[PDB]
Symmetry: C3
């Protein structure tokens, strides 16, 4: 009887940050209430000033990470304001039935809906828009995110012992297919609808023009680099709603990795690089052992360094010469 | 001494259906006899009427699923009628030696051969044609299928407890590379041989023009949707002889998944999406919990919804509001 | 205190062979000293005579396999002779900190450096060049290899029992992106630097022109086929520094496979084909059961048979008719 369960309202935060939550559940099952507003907006995605009409949940690419526990209910109020031009919906890969909710959440501009579903399987899962007949256009315009369903007793290692993270970040990776003219220059459009047939042709090449973290080339660099300290335990949730990726922490490892994101399985240990299939979220746990700059990349290095799938960590603390040292510095 | 073993003749059925078999072996090891006839035929693969010269085992794309038990012998009579134009052979990834049988089964039109091999490893495995110098042309013209070698005691979960399926379906996924003229229109040819150099050039782009289930866009929809009932346990065998895929049941999960298809390994649990590498068969087990339409897709959504890699399940039964419900239907 | 540990100097050998080592450690932890010389050289990569300016560690593509044990120290003297034209460095995915060593090993032509790192995680790992701003160009010009860190007690199966190999081979798989003119012909350049902007444009297509084992189409065939005997236990280490691959032994299996290459995890059993993600090394163990020719391929068969990712094993010994036999040889 759901009416007797506690309700808790969560205010979401912008990726790559994650809303406050408890790893080990401090309450019984709850109805966890979220609200998201759909925003179609112009986004500049590279250093050249290339602009697309992005389709977003809550104004960001990716959409925000939602965090609940196994056997909580998720109640999502989804709002499509009348300033938008398209029909949207939402499909949760965490959910059972009705196309993940897509069949029940079709909202025209000026409409809203509220969906509830039970989070029966623990793991990180993709959510994305999926309107009939226009599914990849919405997804590849940025309309995807992820949801994490923690076990009620938190994460465990391969021997069943607790794993506790100190920090968590969410990296959404996005493949974009920006249409090009005859000579290879990117086209611009006044409205999302203008782009539609050119977008289909661009997608059918299967060759993205940009692959980015957090919605733009260089988004997770500089003042927006991810941070940690030596000794900190960090969980990085990574999603890709449409196309395979292979994350790698340059200078580190994935100590414990759930490449396909489902926590009832034991983690893979000591990974250099792992494959997250398109339409999946995964999670990697690492304890930092050295300070400095790290690069976190899709290790198709062309995708990383030419097309945009690279971010940075900046790590503070003490250098350990036992792990690595320069014996003879570069010299003639 | 093989001459003292029982022989049993199996009549194959057209995908996505699977011939009758027992999950737990009710006899000792047997010689299991199959016959396949090669048929080169014209196939219409999309709604626009695009036609290719397909190369098939038993008239279908994919070829039929063969089912035996571990340590059975498979004896295959392979017939290449004189109405065909090409040399063909067969390579079983389940088999040990002679290029999987390919070296021993080269049949010109008007020839036949009989191969026997012992099924020593349990799992689902690809089989495909592989003639010297023309391997990817035959495979990507549809000349592939799969074989399932069940353990003698059936399937088991990750704790070693029995898993019994109620229904089984076989989804063969096919990448096609239809040659195009200067403007992007598909070419037509009178005979398979006419297409050969244009086919090589089309394949070398690494970009399929169509990716389909059961040989055509929309093949597993409408009257040919897959069916199940709420509460039924369904095993879906999925193969891809040449190119990676990432299956996903929209509105469901893979409860138990052998992504690379080999049953001595524990299944992965609770998968949203899984990667089947090209040249592999995998298997996913799901118990339906909600009625309605489900879409089963390759979750590169461009590959699914633009290029053809999508099918439907239609599921009968009772709706469970505890798992999902619309709290407020879409409204202004 | 490192100064009290034994030092041992290893002389590397050319792939696909591997330097002598012990599987089970016969000494305590050591400092293992390697020297590598960088060589930029012209390489002919196909039967048509296509030439690239390759960037190599020790004159080969791939670079040589280094073998140590867990908790050894690796000390690498890296030499960039003044006959080269470019800055180079090295990044070990086995190492912790400083971008895998890349930040500490930048050598202009005429310089050398010595790096030491502790091998704290067992597995096979990629190493590659990664200079700031030119990472994929160096990697996709051949500047990558692998390092194997064995557990001190050797390899184990999924039940923790020892696995001992009789022979080991290293297959480096390389994606090349040779620039093309308007009509599709490959361009030639006097120096590596001439090619740079054309190389960037070629890489951004994400479509390799060649995918090869051991640096050229057909490198592991003929007199250079890999050899084994029936009954021999063979470990094949396979790396791909940039792009996914899916190895398959035609006529065999991977009996025990570490697809993502990390030995603290149990192997996957009985694999037909396995996925090694780009930026990863994996390892497969097989016991040969039949003599004859085997093909070892990337099982995207277009990549294998059209673009070059195929090699051969030639296996001596006795044929076993119980496993496979021709019952009726091909006939009219
Ligand atoms: O846009 N409806 O609240
Ligand atoms: O190429 N990944 O869908
Ligand atoms: O092929 N996915 O990067
Ligand atoms: O080791 N980074 O590509
Ligand atoms: O999906 N389990 O990593
Ligand atoms: O075509 N031979 O039966
Ligand atoms: O892209 N899969 O071979
Ligand atoms: O890249 N395989 O869809
Ligand atoms: O959730 N289906 O793409
Ligand atoms: O290959 N075992 O899923
Ligand atoms: O090139 N320095 O030895
Ligand atoms: O397509 N593999 O990076
Ligand atoms: O997509 N890698 O072959
Ligand atoms: O079975 N070899 O492609
Ligand atoms: O990475 N372990 O196969
Ligand atoms: Cu939308
Ligand atoms: Cu989806
Ligand atoms: Cu054939
Ligand atoms: Cu094969
Ligand atoms: Cu270099
Ligand atoms: Cu790397």
């Amino acid at each position: 009887d759901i009416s007797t369960l506690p309700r808790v309202k969560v205010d979401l935060v912008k990726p790559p940050f994650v809303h406050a939550h408890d790893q080990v559940a401090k309450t019984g099952p709850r109805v966890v209430e979220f609200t998201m507003t759909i925003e179609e907006k112009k986004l500049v995605i590279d250093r050249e000033g290339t602009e697309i009409h992005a389709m977003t949940f809550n104004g960001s690419v990716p959409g925000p990470l939602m965090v609940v526990h196994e056997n909580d209910y998720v109640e999502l109020r989804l709002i499509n304001p009348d300033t938008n031009t398209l029909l949207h919906n939402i499909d949760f890969h965490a959910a059972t039935g009705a196309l993940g909710g897509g069949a029940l959440t079709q909202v025209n501009p000026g409409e809203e809906t509220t969906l509830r579903f039970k989070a029966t399987k623990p793991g990180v899962f993709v959510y994305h828009c999926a309107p009939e007949g226009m599914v990849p256009w919405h997804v590849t315009s940025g309309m995807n995110g992820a949801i994490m369903v923690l076990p009620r007793d938190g994460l465990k290692d391969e021997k069943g012992q607790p794993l506790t993270y100190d920090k968590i970040y969410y990296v959404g990776e996005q493949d974009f297919y920006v249409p090009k003219d005859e000579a290879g220059n990117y086209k611009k459009y006044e409205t999302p609808g203008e782009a539609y047939e050119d977008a289909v042709k661009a997608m059918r090449t299967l060759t993205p023009t940009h692959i980015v973290f957090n919605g733009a080339v260089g988004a997770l660099t500089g003042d927006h680099a991810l941070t940690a300290a030596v000794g900190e335990r960090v969980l990085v949730v990574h999603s890709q709603a449409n196309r395979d990726t292979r994350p790698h922490l340059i200078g580190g490892h994935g100590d414990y990795v759930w490449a396909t994101g489902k926590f009832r399985n034991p983690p893979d240990l000591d990974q250099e690089t792992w494959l997250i299939p398109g339409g999946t979220a995964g999670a990697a746990f690492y304890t930092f052992r050295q300070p400095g700059v790290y690069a976190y990349v899709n290790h198709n290095l062309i995708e990383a360094f030419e097309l945009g799938a690279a971010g940075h960590f900046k790590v503070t603390g003490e250098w350990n010469d036992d792990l690595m040292t320069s014996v003879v510095k570069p010299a003639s």
